[PDB]
Each structure stands twice: as structure tokens, then as C-alpha cells.
Design an enzyme around this catalytic site. Structure first.
Site, PDB file in Angstrom:
ATOM      1  N   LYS A  51       0.749  -1.111  -0.215  1.00 37.74           N
ATOM      2  CA  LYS A  51      -0.088   0.111   0.070  1.00 37.74           C
ATOM      3  C   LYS A  51       0.950   1.299  -0.075  1.00 37.74           C
ATOM      4  CE  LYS A  51      -4.440   1.842   1.874  1.00 37.74           C
ATOM      5  NZ  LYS A  51      -3.656   3.279   1.859  1.00 37.74           N
ATOM      6  N   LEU A  53       3.215   1.769  -2.035  1.00 37.43           N
ATOM      7  CA  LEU A  53       3.632   2.062  -3.300  1.00 37.43           C
ATOM      8  C   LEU A  53       2.596   2.933  -3.860  1.00 37.43           C
ATOM      9  CD1 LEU A  53       5.030  -1.320  -4.225  1.00 37.43           C
ATOM     10  CD2 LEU A  53       6.138   0.815  -3.273  1.00 37.43           C
ATOM     11  N   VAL A  56      -1.019   1.403  -5.708  1.00 36.27           N
ATOM     12  CA  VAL A  56      -1.643   0.431  -4.752  1.00 36.27           C
ATOM     13  C   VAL A  56      -2.339   0.895  -3.619  1.00 36.27           C
ATOM     14  CG1 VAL A  56      -1.142  -1.574  -3.230  1.00 36.27           C
ATOM     15  CG2 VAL A  56       0.266  -1.086  -5.207  1.00 36.27           C
ATOM     16  N   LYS A  63      -6.342  -7.467  -1.496  1.00 37.37           N
ATOM     17  CA  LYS A  63      -6.253  -8.621  -2.285  1.00 37.37           C
ATOM     18  C   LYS A  63      -5.150  -9.151  -2.043  1.00 37.37           C
ATOM     19  CE  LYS A  63      -9.575  -7.522  -5.725  1.00 37.37           C
ATOM     20  NZ  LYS A  63     -10.530  -6.667  -5.287  1.00 37.37           N
ATOM     21  N   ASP A 181       6.171  -8.271 -31.514  1.00 40.26           N
ATOM     22  CA  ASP A 181       6.023  -7.911 -32.753  1.00 40.26           C
ATOM     23  C   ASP A 181       6.897  -7.135 -33.167  1.00 40.26           C
ATOM     24  OD1 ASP A 181       5.248  -5.245 -31.799  1.00 40.26           O
ATOM     25  OD2 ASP A 181       3.603  -5.035 -32.884  1.00 40.26           O
ATOM     26  N   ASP A 183       7.893  -3.217 -34.967  1.00 41.81           N
ATOM     27  CA  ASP A 183       7.404  -1.889 -34.793  1.00 41.81           C
ATOM     28  C   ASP A 183       8.632  -1.049 -35.757  1.00 41.81           C
ATOM     29  OD1 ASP A 183       5.295  -2.106 -32.982  1.00 41.81           O
ATOM     30  OD2 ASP A 183       6.776  -2.579 -31.697  1.00 41.81           O
ATOM     31  N   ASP A 247       4.003  -3.452 -37.602  1.00 40.40           N
ATOM     32  CA  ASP A 247       3.353  -2.155 -37.477  1.00 40.40           C
ATOM     33  C   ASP A 247       4.270  -1.071 -38.140  1.00 40.40           C
ATOM     34  OD1 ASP A 247       1.205  -3.028 -36.017  1.00 40.40           O
ATOM     35  OD2 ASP A 247       2.126  -2.844 -34.265  1.00 40.40           O
TER      36      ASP A 247
HETATM   37 MG   LIG Z   1       6.184  -4.346 -30.470  1.00 41.51          MG
HETATM   38 MG   LIG Z   2       3.349  -3.263 -32.656  1.00 44.98          MG
HETATM   39 NA    NA Z   3      -0.451   3.625  -2.398  1.00 42.76          NA
END
Ligand SMILES: [Mg+2]
Ligand SMILES: [Mg+2]
Ligand code: NA
Ligand SMILES: [Cl-]
Ligand SMILES: [Cl-]
Ligand SMILES: [Mg+2]
Ligand SMILES: [Mg+2]
Ligand SMILES: [Mg+2]
Length: 322
Positions: A51, A53, A56, A63, A181, A183, A247
Site C-alpha cells: 500500500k 507504493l 496500490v 487482495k 511484434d 514496430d 506495424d
Molecule cells: Mg512491439
Molecule cells: Mg506493434
Molecule cells: Na499507495
DNA sequence: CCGACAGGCGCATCAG
DNA sequence: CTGATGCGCCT
DNA sequence: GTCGG
């Protein structure tokens, strides 16, 4: 990794919020938490420790206490067992199917890859290709293959016009051992923010990459952005390389540094950096950095200049990763 | 408490 | 047709 | 879901 259980939990929740709930800011809050926790250099011992951080809060920390005590989250256990949630999540794995279409498909009884195949005529063009290469697009690309793909794209762009500069960005530029991927950021002197002195600058490159059989399919294509599929050549008797996502972004030559900053990411880094630009009275996009109603573009002749404007120490691409 | 949360390309759709 | 909207995508 | 003012 340290705190891998926790960050996996948070990423699953982020994906649930994005894909099922369609709650983009919850998605982003979970990812911001996951990110800050992944960088935290200690084994988290409680939710109260986490918490502290930024990103958070009470609900995540709660949780985390549950996760540390039990090794699981009842909330996710229920989501996992929920057939509709799981189906919607699954379908979004197909490129071109997001949360809306996934829910629509699941409502029409389309639950599986099998179901998508027998209903191709319900898919748009992008979704068709994403289904076609579903297994391939979830495979990552070793940096060795990224280097071969780079060699092809750079030399083929050079055959079209020696004045193009192609720069491979994304995780590759950040020095990653594997990429999801490719780019490619592209410039040409005829295309600046002040003029387009030659038409079809991107088209000509895409066309050349198709002629040599590197680009195999097209997801989308306009004057400045291309989204498609490519594949390395394989040798006699060898299995084919998977098809890969590519891309290409053509960016005005005088706006190269804002373009490369954007295209280098990471995505989370870019959101954090743009959010901090806002706190400092600036807006950053892939073209410019503007004072804030945004005003006129500030002069930039390095990536570092952009960091300077917002009072950040330069980060090398390798240090912009998650 | 609560407004803001990064920014935008290409494509599909809708109103008129 | 234009212009507006939102989806899904990219970092 | 989180947080600064
Ligand atoms: Mg990429
Ligand atoms: Mg990409
Ligand atoms: Na926090
Ligand atoms: Cl986002
Ligand atoms: Cl701009
Ligand atoms: Mg998808
Ligand atoms: Mg990515
Ligand atoms: Mg959006």
C-alpha cells in the site's frame, strides 16, 4: 520474478476489468499497480507494505493480503469458473476482437476458436486475419529473428529510396531478448510537419515489402500507419517461420524524436511519462510536446529534450521496460 | 470527496 | 456524401 | 481502483 504471484494476480484482474467489465480505468489502475509492484525490489510481505507504493490502494492491498495468506484470490477463482467471462476473455485474444465484439459473439453462441472458424462471415477483415494467424500471433519473436527482419526492412526501404530512415522501435529498441511484434518508425525528408512533398511515401515501402513476400497480409493501412503481417523466408526443407505482426508508422521527419519516444514505449512508460507531462503543464503525443488547451510545439532535437522539459532524468530505452 | 486517469490512427457505423 | 462516435489497435 | 489537492 519477485512478487510474480502478486503481479500475475493483478494482470488477470486488469484483463477481467478490460475484457469483461469494460472498465478501462480499472484495467489501467490494476496495470499501474502491477507495474509498480514488479519494480519493487523486495519480496512483499503484506498488503500494508504494498500500500505504500503509488498506485496500490486499500482494495489492492486487501487482495494482496488474501493472496499472501491463501495463495489465491476467491474473486479470480469465481471469474475463472464463470463460463461467459472466460469465453469473452478468450475471444479478445484474437487480434481485432475487443471486449464489445467478444461480448456480442458470446451472446450469439460463439464461444470457441471452432465457433469463430465456422462463422468467418461475421468477422471483419482484421478479425479474419487475426483468426487466421491466431496461434502464430501469440508466439514471441527471438531477437535473432528480429535482427533478420530488421535487415530485410532496412535494405528494402533503402531500395525504394536511400533517403528513407527506418528505425525498429518497441521492445526491440529497449533491448529485449524477445519481442511480441515488429514496430518500424519511418521517415522521409519529403514529409515534414510543414509539407508533404511526395505522395504515397508509406504505400511505396509497404508495396516493396509485399513484392519481396515479406509482408503477407494487411490489417489496416492509411497514409501514416500500416498494421499487417510479415514472415521471414525459410530455407529448403525447413519448417516455415511463424507469421508475425508488423506495424509501420510514418512520422514527419522534423518530429522524429517525439515519434521514436512514442514508438519505443513501453506502453506503461508512455502513460506514466505523458501523465507526468500533464502534472508539469505539458502534453506529449507522437509528434510534439506542447505547453498547456495546448499551445504551440516546443523545439526538440533529442529524446532527452523531452525528458528535460518535464524535469525527468533521461532514461535509456533499455530502462523504459516493465 | 472527487475529477481525472495518454493520446491518437484506421476502420465501421450512424444521422442526415 | 460529411461529420461525429466509438472500437480496437499501437507505444 | 487510486490519489492529489
Ligand atoms: Mg512491439
Ligand atoms: Mg506493434
Ligand atoms: Na499507495
Ligand atoms: Cl491504456
Ligand atoms: Cl501535435
Ligand atoms: Mg483482441
Ligand atoms: Mg505491446
Ligand atoms: Mg479508446
Amino acid at each position: 520474478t519477485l512478487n510474480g504471484g502478486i503481479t500475475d494476480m493483478l494482470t488477470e484482474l486488469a484483463n477481467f476489468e478490460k475484457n469483461v467489465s469494460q472498465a478501462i480505468h480499472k484495467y489501467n489502475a490494476y496495470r499501474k499497480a502491477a507495474s509498480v509492484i514488479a519494480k519493487y525490489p523486495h519480496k512483499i510481505k503484506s498488503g500494508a507494505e504494498a500500500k505504500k507504493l503509488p498506485g496500490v490502494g486499500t482494495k489492492i492491498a486487501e487482495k494482496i493480503d488474501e493472496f499472501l495468506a491463501t495463495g489465491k484470490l476467491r474473486k479470480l477463482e469465481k471469474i475463472r469458473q464463470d463460463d461467459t467471462s472466460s469465453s469473452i476473455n478468450f475471444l479478445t485474444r484474437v487480434s481485432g476482437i475487443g471486449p464489445s465484439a467478444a461480448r456480442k459473439f458470446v451472446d450469439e453462441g460463439i464461444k470457441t476458436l471452432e465457433d469463430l472458424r465456422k462463422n468467418e462471415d461475421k468477422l471483419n477483415h482484421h478479425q479474419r486475419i487475426g483468426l487466421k494467424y491466431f496461434g502464430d500471433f501469440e508466439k514471441r519473436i527471438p531477437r535473432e529473428e528480429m535482427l533478420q527482419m530488421q535487415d530485410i526492412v532496412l535494405n528494402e526501404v533503402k531500395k525504394v529510396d536511400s533517403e528513407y530512415i527506418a528505425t525498429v522501435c518497441g521492445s526491440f529498441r529497449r533491448g529485449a531478448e524477445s519481442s511480441g511484434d515488429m514496430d518500424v518508425l519511418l521517415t522521409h525528408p519529403s514529409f515534414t510537419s510543414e509539407s508533404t512533398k511526395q505522395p504515397k511515401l508509406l504505400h511505396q515501402v509497404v508495396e516493396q515489402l509485399q513484392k519481396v513476400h515479406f509482408i503477407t497480409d494487411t490489417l489496416s493501412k492509411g497514409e501514416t500507419k500500416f498494421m499487417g503481417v510479415c514472415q521471414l523466408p525459410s530455407k529448403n526443407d525447413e519448417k516455415e517461420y511463424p507469421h508475425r505482426r508488423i506495424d509501420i508508422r510514418l512520422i514527419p521527419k522534423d518530429q522524429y524524436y517525439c515519434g521514436v519516444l512514442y514508438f519505443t514505449g513501453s506502453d506503461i512508460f508512455n502513460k506514466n511519462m505523458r501523465a507526468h507531462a500533464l502534472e508539469k503543464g505539458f502534453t506529449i503525443n507522437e509528434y510534439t510536446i506542447r505547453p498547456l488547451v495546448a499551445g504551440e510545439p516546443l523545439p526538440v532535437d533529442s529524446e532527452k529534450d523531452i525528458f528535460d522539459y518535464i524535469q525527468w532524468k533521461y532514461r535509456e530505452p533499455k530502462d523504459r521496460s516493465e
